[PDB]
Amino acid sequence: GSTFVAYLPDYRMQEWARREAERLVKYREANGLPLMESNCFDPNKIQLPEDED
Amino acid sequence: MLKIIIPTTMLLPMTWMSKHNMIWINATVHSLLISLISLSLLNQLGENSLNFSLTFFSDSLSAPLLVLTTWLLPLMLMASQSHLSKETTTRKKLYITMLILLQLFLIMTFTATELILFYILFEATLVPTLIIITRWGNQTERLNAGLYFLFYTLAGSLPLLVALVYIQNTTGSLNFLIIHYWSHPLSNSWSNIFMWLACIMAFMVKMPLYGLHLWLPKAHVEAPIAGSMVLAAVLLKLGGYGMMRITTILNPLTNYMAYPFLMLSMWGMIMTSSICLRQTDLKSLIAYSSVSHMALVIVAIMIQTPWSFMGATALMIAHGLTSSMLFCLANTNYERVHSRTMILARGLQTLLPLMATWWLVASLTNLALPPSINLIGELFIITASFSWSNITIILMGMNMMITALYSLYMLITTQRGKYTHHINNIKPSFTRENALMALHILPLLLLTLNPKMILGPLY
Amino acid sequence: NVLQIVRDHWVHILVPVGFVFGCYLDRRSDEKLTAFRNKSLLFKRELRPNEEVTWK
Amino acid sequence: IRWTYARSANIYPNFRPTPKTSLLGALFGIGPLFFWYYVFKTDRDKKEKLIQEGKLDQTFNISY
Amino acid sequence: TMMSGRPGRVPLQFLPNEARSLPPPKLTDPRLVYMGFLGYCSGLIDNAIRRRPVVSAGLHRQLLYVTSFVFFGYYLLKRQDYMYALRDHDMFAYVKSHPEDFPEKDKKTYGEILEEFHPVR
Amino acid sequence: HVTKDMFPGPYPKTPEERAAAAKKYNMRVEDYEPYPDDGMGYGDYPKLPDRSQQERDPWYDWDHPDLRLNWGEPIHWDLDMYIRNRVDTSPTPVSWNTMCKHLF
Amino acid sequence: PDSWDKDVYPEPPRRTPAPAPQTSLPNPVTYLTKIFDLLVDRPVTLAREFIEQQHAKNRYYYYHREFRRVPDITECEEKDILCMFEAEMQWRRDYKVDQEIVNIIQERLKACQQREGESYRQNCAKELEQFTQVSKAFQDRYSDLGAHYSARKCLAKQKQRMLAERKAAKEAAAA
Amino acid sequence: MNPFASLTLTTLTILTIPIMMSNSNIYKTNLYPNYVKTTVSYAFTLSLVPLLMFMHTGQEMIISNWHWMTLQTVELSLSFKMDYFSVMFIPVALFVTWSIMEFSMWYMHSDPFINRFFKYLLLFLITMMILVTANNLFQLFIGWEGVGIMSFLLIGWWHGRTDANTAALQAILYNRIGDIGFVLSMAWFLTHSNAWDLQQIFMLNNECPNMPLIGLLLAAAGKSAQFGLHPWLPSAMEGPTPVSALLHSSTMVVAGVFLLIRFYPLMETNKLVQTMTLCLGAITTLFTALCAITQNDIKKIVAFSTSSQLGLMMVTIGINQPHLAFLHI
Amino acid sequence: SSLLDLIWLETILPKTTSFIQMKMSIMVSNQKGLIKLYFLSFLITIMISMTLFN
Ligand SMILES: CCCCCCCCCCCCCCCCCC(=O)OC[C@H](COP(=O)([O-])OCC(O)COP(=O)([O-])OC[C@@H](COC(=O)CCCCCCCCCCCCCCCCC)OC(=O)CCCCCCCCCCCCCCCCC)OC(=O)CCCCCCCCCCCCCCCCC
Ligand SMILES: CCCCCCCCCCCCCCCCC[C@@H](O)O[C@H](CO[C@H](O)CCCCCCCCCCCCCCC)COP(=O)(O)OCC[N+](C)(C)C
Ligand SMILES: CCCCCCCCCCCCCCCCC[C@@H](O)O[C@H](CO[C@H](O)CCCCCCCCCCCCCCC)COP(=O)(O)OCC[N+](C)(C)C
Ligand SMILES: CCCCCCCC/C=C\CCCCCCCC(=O)O[C@H](COC(=O)CCCCCCC/C=C/CCCCCCCC)COP(=O)(O)OCCN
């Protein structure tokens, strides 16, 4: 059972996330983009309520 | 999930159709095989969950608890084999039936996609434990203990049921996935405050909370060894699991409502660790140590940060294993001396050296020596509390110091010094007891190699 | 000896049988949750030439 | 056995509500709780205010 | 939902004729299996009370217990399914006939819904 | 093998039950002195001197040489406080107040 | 080595000095590292050659999984559970990838600190600035959601932040 | 291929082989102590190589070989720091331990459990090397607690003696008082610098605040027996003389000082913590020498001498001279 | 150990509940079996019921 737990396949996607981050950082560093963005979602597709205060 | 539930059910006819002298062997072998099968639930996802069906689902919080529950039954059988020797076949079969029913209810409780189903099984676990305590306990206080262990629980659990049905009358569902996805904030209202209390108090009483912990020393002291093992290892964790599940609907009211429970836990850990320093009974000392550890887990759950939840999961698993081992050591001493008074049998290192090594390793894990998972959970909770408020460090460090003090006091009193002269019935340790001790302790030191298996869903 | 130890060891076979029955029942319950098979936006996949279902 | 019984099980039947007992119980069982509540509440209110003005310097504070 | 006064309800029919338009429960229904299990438990308890070998005292009597429990459970399941079907039918008809009491909510995306955010600190 | 009459009981009021309590604890009536009758649950239990186990005679042939205790003798209420592993009250060459003043 | 991308994990060109023995006395380091080479490095190299030929006899491949883009929580109706499920899974995957990005930048910073030695305070300003920017963005995204986080809570936090930003900009314009 | 890393890890690795054989047949014979002594001597003569390589070039490494759990943005890995302090202290500790074991082969010849005693000494040496070479705070905490547990086991070597058990529990109590500050520092560094690795701690702390450095100073005061937490070191003379000579004289008790040497880049940016360290060292060395000049037990006199020398070491730390304190160690 | 855990925590939740339920049970179940008192209470309850509701 210990050997079975040791060799469990990566269903948590640790290496997958590492590779995704690697290629994403390579892309943004090449294009000069500011690495991580501060907004999680695009602001153009959010409709804020106008205050008119 | 039926591939684990059905074999556990088949444990019953197999037990009742067994020979009079094969019940222990068959029960142990097939419970070990069920544990091995359940070990494959540990392959969890980074995404939502293992949603088997509409009724049962698995999670990386539920999977370690399920595996520990399945692993505890063979150890409980090995511990119970000794003191049930002089008893009839039908009664031993009934005892094994109670253990199997407890395992079945716990397994179904930990998956339990429905909150009402979770409540039903979470309260169904009450009956086998009460029967075990009040039937196969030794002293005359067991009945009283059972009463406490009953009513406290129900005193917390009856309001919860009302709250639960109320939620489904407003939300329309009590499925945990729908609840998580459709969660909404709780406004600061008196009705919402009482809904919060009805949701929390049932799980608080079984941790137990410091003010509400009176039932635990009685129930753990008067119970037989299997009862104490299952009470300390799995049954105390039902409150933590329930809180971790239910705090998703209590935001943002938890920010205000957590203060009295946070103060109660932070002061009660110090109080119970100090109580351990002056204890004349081994089982009572171990019970109060359990209260302190669960107070730390309560703090972790109330802070409700990722590091808090990871530390709480790790500490729940580690405490279950360590407390079961400590109770088993105490029972090995008791079955020789029949007294359960710590000061009576002294200097047992000179007579039982390997059992002294087991005592040392159990005290070391209780002391939270790194890199054990006990210290992993301890440190994660402590760091989360420090981020919550820098002044928690005083209470946390004081608790660590007192914990080390009473653990080494327990070790030194029983193992070191001079042997008691008039005690001459200390027989050499049996292979069964040594095997039980190793089967407790190797999983801990082997889990410290793969901590992510017991760090919960927020890892 | 055959036909003699069976009458003394028949009970042992029950737990293993339960494990198989539970696996079968789990698959049967899986067969009732195929309302979205090969329909999720994440895994909309065009079937292979000799394929019936993406997963069973 | 007399020692252990007196230490554990002889306490409550010999207990009486007394001014000494009542005041000691109230103090030693309530005062620490309210003291720690005041301390932690004051610390957290100060922290929350400082976050509101933004003068806390929470840079590199990623794990919580 | 009190259905005692529901129109067109024959007084003492266990199963009305319209219930025959519903699919009957399968014989391998889990609820039927639980009914048979309850019959088996009743047989075992009957053996135990009479001080007879519990598992193998009367096979005819245990078979009769199981069979009667399964029979009654089948008919009970049919009636239960029929009553739930009536509840759903009446609910849908009432919603259909009273549109003003069940107006359609305007489908609104989370992009333009303002939910208050509460930090955890 | 202990009967109900051999267990600790309530605080004794009359000299007759005082003598009974002294006889129960295997010690003289003149030496028996219970804790003051307060709200604490001391009940009927001797208030032995607060001297520690370390200052008991180490050359005596105790039945428990490490604890320095005899078999039937009454046990101090705070035995586990004074076990030679913990706080002792042995007389010191210098008075406690003098040491406190000097250290401070 | 080719086992990792040099651009994601950069290194300076590794200038090393040449030996300049000013005395004729034999330094024990050279002889001792030569005997280490002879007694250790060659047998290890030969064992690796054996293992690598055996691996080359049996060659098979594994693939990195590609995940499609799905509508996020903003394009989801208030009670449409299926789209919320899709968006929540996508958001969790993005959160994990962001954590890995922060890990990469932190590894860069640690390597710089160890490599530049006694002048790390000046020769690691680039990595410090990169880590500061990435840390600020990651904090703005995920600082205070707590346990029981979701895409909805992150969206609410973003909406609150950008409402505050719009108010501040409007106050500056009308100053 | 650049044998620095391979040899500096082979030292610590071969230190652990007799612990593996502690269940073999040699552990049941009378050749086990000589086996352990020979292993330690071989470890010393092998660790002499990285010392030469550093002395020739100044060669430095971080070896993060095994990646243990990762905590969202925090990665925890088994990492060894092989700087000047590690590669200089390891040969000294190995030489002293070799002499201690050869001495113990004669001093403890009549002890029935001598193989166990030798095994305990090797375990302490392993935990001390873990403490010295640790690159992150979790590994150094592992070594920190391991040396303390070994000290508890070796002080209470004669477990039938009440005073030995009392002294061992005393040492545990004082070291837990220091552990409070250790855990405080670890929590602060994780919360503020997002790391337990030394490189990120140094990079992100240009002007270190008071809490982490005060926690570090409290841990150092606990483990090096400074004035507030001093008595456990003289009380620790209850153990056998080899234990007093190895652990509580020259190797374990300097660990606290070593910690403040390991965090010296942050100490030089704080002015109040330096003053606190200087005053604590001064009062410790004065008080312990004053106690020493009048004692009658020779081991007590040498223990008070050790405490005074530790106080002098932390005076050197407090005057911002860490390398000089290491040389004194 | 004694003042809070063995005395006051017992006094507050469990002992108080036991005492109150004990006294209430004694008050409820102590009727001498005389139907005169029973039907006097019946008249009282009946009279009270008619007036309060309407
Ligand atoms: C969650 C759902 C899933 C699990 C379901 C759980 C319930 C299922 C069963 C329900 C009721 C059925 C049986 C009840 C009748 C009583 C029988 C009895 O007394 O036992 C003696 C009898 C053996 O003794 P005997 O030599 O024949 O005659 C001696 C006297 O009978 C007896 O000798 P004695 O009278 O001289 O000895 C005195 C003893 C005898 O007194 C008793 O033991 C009476 C039994 C308890 C009454 C049960 C009440 C009704 C059931 C409700 C259970 C509630 C469950 C909810 C959870 C809360 C837990 C309480 O009384 C005492 O010692 C008093 C002190 C005991 C402590 C307090 C009692 C605790 C009661 C809690 C028991 C709950 C579990 C019971 C399990 C079944 C017990 C056999 O046991 C059996 O053999 C029957 C066991 C079932 C047979 C299974 C056959 C199937 C195997 C082959 C086919 C494989 C199937 C799979 C297909 C695939 C294969 C290829
Ligand atoms: C007697 C004196 C000693 C003699 C023996 C000497 C030899 C000692 C060596 C053993 C201890 C030294 C530690 C060195 C560890 C080496 C093995 C380790 O590295 O493997 C671990 C692997 O082991 C597992 O991680 C831990 C085992 C899991 C434990 C499961 C418990 C078993 C079930 C029992 C019931 C459960 C009860 C508790 C309920 C919770 C971690 O590997 P990891 O880098 O990560 O990935 C594995 C390989 N990959 C990369 C292909 C994936
Ligand atoms: C005994 C062992 C442990 C058991 C469990 C103990 C844990 C239970 C503690 C309950 C948690 C808190 C309960 C109520 C919290 C509300 C906040 C309150 O304390 O603060 C003030 C509340 O004011 C006063 O408290 C009003 C109520 C006064 C009456 C309460 C009785 C005081 C002592 C009772 C304690 C007994 C507990 C056990 C009962 C059996 C603020 O006043 P205000 O801002 O305007 O209104 C806030 C609430 N709103 C917004 C919904 C309207
Ligand atoms: C260990 C023993 C503990 C015993 C139980 C402790 C938990 C007590 C929690 C309260 C119990 C009942 C609460 C109700 C369950 C939730 C239902 C709910 O939230 O609905 C509320 C209803 O709120 C209530 O009715 C609450 C009334 C509570 C009456 C019983 C009081 C019990 C004792 C009160 C003091 C102690 C409270 C905390 C004790 C903690 C345990 C020590 C609002 O719904 P509506 O009124 O329909 O909508 C508003 C518009 N009309």
Question: Which string of DSSP letters, residue by residue, matches B53-77?
Answer: SSS-EE-TTHHHHHHHHHHHHHHHH
Residue G77, phi then psi, degrees to nearest 5? -70, 160
Q: Which residues of H touch G107 (CB under 8 A)?
A: 75
For residue D63, give both structure tokens: 């794990």
Residue H93: partners with Cβ closer than 8 Å, 6 or more residues away: H125, H128, H129, H132, H251
Out of A20, A36, A46, name the one closest to residue G137 (CB): A36
In testing the pocket of ligand 1, which one of E33, E42, E52, E54 has its CB within 8 Å of the most ligand atoms? E54
What's the rounded Cα separation, in Å, for the pair B382 and B311? 9
Q: Is the CB of B368 under 6 A from ligand 1?
A: no
Q: Structurally, how many domains does chain E consist of?
A: 1
For residue B100, give both structure tokens: 């199997």
Listed in order, strand segments (DSSP E) in B129-265 are: none
Domain membership of residue C56 as a residue range: 1-56
Out of B17, B185, B305, name the one closest to residue E116 (CB): B185
Cβ pair B329, B359 in contact under 8 A: yes
Quick one: three-class SS letters along chain C?
CCCCCHHHHHHHHHHHHHHHHHHHHHHHHHCCCCCCCCCCCCCCCCCCCCCCCCCC
Out of D3, D14, D22, name the one closest to residue F43 (CB): D14
Roughly what angle, to the nearest 10 degrees, separates helices H32-57 and G28-36? 120
Ligand closest to Cα of B36 equals 2
Q: Is the CB of B32 under 6 A from ligand 2?
A: no
Residue H112, phi then psi, degrees to nearest 5? -60, -35
Amino acid at H273: V
What's the rounded Cα separation, in Å, for the pair F80 and B279? 8
What's the rounded Cα separation, in Å, for the pair B228 and B328? 9
Q: Which residues of H touch B396 (CB under 8 A)?
A: 183
What's the rounded Cα separation, in Å, for the pair A23 and E64? 71
What's the rounded Cα separation, in Å, for the pair G63 and G76? 32
C-alpha B164 to ligand 4 mean position (Å): 12
Is E106 inside any structural domain? Answer: no
What's the rounded Cα separation, in Å, for the pair B62 and B313? 10
- Nearest CA-CA partner of H66 in H49, H78, H48, H50: H78
Amino acid at G121: R
Out of D8, D17, D25, name the one closest to residue I4 (CB): D25
Q: Do I13 and B214 touch (CB under 8 A)?
A: yes
Resolution in A: 2.7
Cα angle B183, B184, B188 (rounded to 5 degrees) comes to: 140
Q: Are strands H74-81 and B50-51 parallel, antiparallel or unpaired?
A: unpaired
Q: How was this structure determined?
A: cryo-EM
Cα angle H206, H311, H48 (rounded to 5 degrees) comes to: 75
Q: Which of ligand 1's atoms lies nearest the C-alpha of B104?
A: 1
Q: Do G103 and H1 touch (CB under 8 A)?
A: no
C-alpha A2 to ligand 2 mean position (Å): 7
Cβ pair B302, B258 in contact under 8 A: yes
Ligand closest to Cα of E51 equals 1
Is the minimum CB–CB distance between G92 and chain C shorter than 8 Å? no
Q: Is the CB of B194 under 6 A from ligand 4?
A: yes
For residue G3, give both structure tokens: 């086992």
- Nearest CA-CA partner of D30 in B292, B258, I4: I4
- Nearest CA-CA partner of B340 in B158, B141, B97: B141
Please give, rounded to a whole number of angstroms, the shortest distance from the CA of E84 to a CA of chain G: 26
Q: Is the CB of B212 under 6 A from ligand 4?
A: yes
Q: Is the CB of E95 under 6 A from ligand 1?
A: no
State the alpha helices, DSSP H only, in chain A.
Answer: 2-6, 14-31
Q: Which residues of D touch F74 (CB under 8 A)?
A: 2
Q: Which residues of A touch B40 (CB under 8 A)?
A: 4
- Nearest CA-CA partner of H117 in H235, H241, H223, H237: H241
C-alpha D53 to ligand 3 mean position (Å): 30
Cβ pair H118, H101 in contact under 8 A: yes
Buried b (16+ CB within 10 A) or exposed e, G72-92: bbbebeeeeeebbbbbbbbbb
Roughly what angle, to the nearest 10 degrees, separates helices B282-303 and B306-337? 170
Q: Whose CA is nearest to atom 25 of ligand 4?
A: B191
What's the rounded Cα separation, in Å, for the pair H165 and B349? 13
- Whose tokens are 């507050």? That residue is I12
- Nearest CA-CA partner of B99 in B62, B65, B136, B64: B136
B30 burial via Cβ count (<10 Å: 0-12, 13-18, 19+): buried
Q: Do chains F and G touch (3 or more CB pairs under 8 A)?
A: no
Q: Are strands H74-81 and H62-71 parallel, antiparallel or unpaired?
A: antiparallel
What's the rounded Cα separation, in Å, for the pair H44 and H97? 9
Q: Whose CA is nearest to atom 5 of ligand 4?
A: B156
Which residues 12-41 of A have a C-beta within 8 angstroms of G? Answer: 13, 16-22, 24-26, 29-30, 34-41
Amino acid at G44: V
Q: Which residues of D touch E121 (CB under 8 A)?
A: 47-48, 51, 64
Q: % helix / strand / coil in chain F, to the nearest 5?
A: 25, 5, 75
Residue B288: in which H helix or E strand, if any? Answer: helix B282-303
Terminal CA-to-CA distance of chain B, rounded, Å?
A: 23
Cβ pair B459, B452 in contact under 8 A: yes
Q: Do B7 and C25 touch (CB under 8 A)?
A: no
Domain membership of residue E73 as a residue range: 1-98
User: What is the SS3 assignment for G143?
Assistant: coil
DSSP-assigned letters across all residues of B383-425: HHHHHH-TTHHHHHHHHHHHHHHHHHHHHHHHHSS---SS---
In this structure, how many other beta carbons lie within 10 angstroms of the beta carbon of residue E47?
18
Residue H75: in which H helix or E strand, if any? Answer: strand H74-81
What's the rounded Cα separation, in Å, for the pair A11 and E59? 52
What's the rounded Cα separation, in Å, for the pair B50 and B43? 9
CA distances from B87 to B80, B94, B136, B255, B430 (A): 12, 11, 11, 54, 21
What's the rounded Cα separation, in Å, for the pair B64 and B312? 12
Q: Is the CB of B260 under 6 A from ligand 3?
A: yes
Q: Structurally, how many domains does chain C consist of?
A: 1
Which DSSP letter does residue F86 get?
Answer: S
Q: Is the CB of B450 under 6 A from ligand 3?
A: no
Please give, rounded to a whole number of angstroms, the shortest distance from the CA of D19 to a CA of chain B: 22
Is E110 inside any structural domain? Answer: no
CA distances from D41 to B383, B388, D33, D34, G28 (A): 19, 11, 12, 10, 66
Bridge partners, residue G163, by sequence: none
What's the rounded Cα separation, in Å, for the pair G100 and A36? 11
CA distances from B305 to B72, B183, G85, H5, H187 (A): 30, 18, 23, 39, 15
Peptide bond into F46 cis (omega under 30): no
Residue B249, phi then psi, degrees to nearest 5? -100, 0
Which chains have 3+ CB pairs within 8 A of D?
Answer: B, E, F, G, H, I
User: What is the SS3 assignment for F63?
Assistant: coil
CB under 8 A, 24+ apart: contacts of B430-438: B432/B78, B432/B81, B432/B82, B433/B328, B433/B332, B433/B355, B434/B354, B434/B355, B434/B358, B435/B78, B436/B75, B436/B78, B436/B79, B436/B328, B437/B325, B437/B328, B437/B329, B437/B355, B437/B358, B437/B362
Bridge partners, residue H71, by sequence: H74
Bridge partners, residue H77, by sequence: H67
In testing the pocket of ligand 3, which one of B189, B192, B193 has its CB within 8 Å of the most ligand atoms? B193
Roughly what angle, to the nearest 10 degrees, separates helices B89-111 and B237-246? 20
- The count of C-alpha atoms lying within 13 angstroms of the C-alpha of G20, restricted to the half-sphere facing its C-beta, is 3
Q: Do B267 and D32 touch (CB under 8 A)?
A: yes
Cα angle B388, B391, B392 (rounded to 5 degrees) comes to: 65
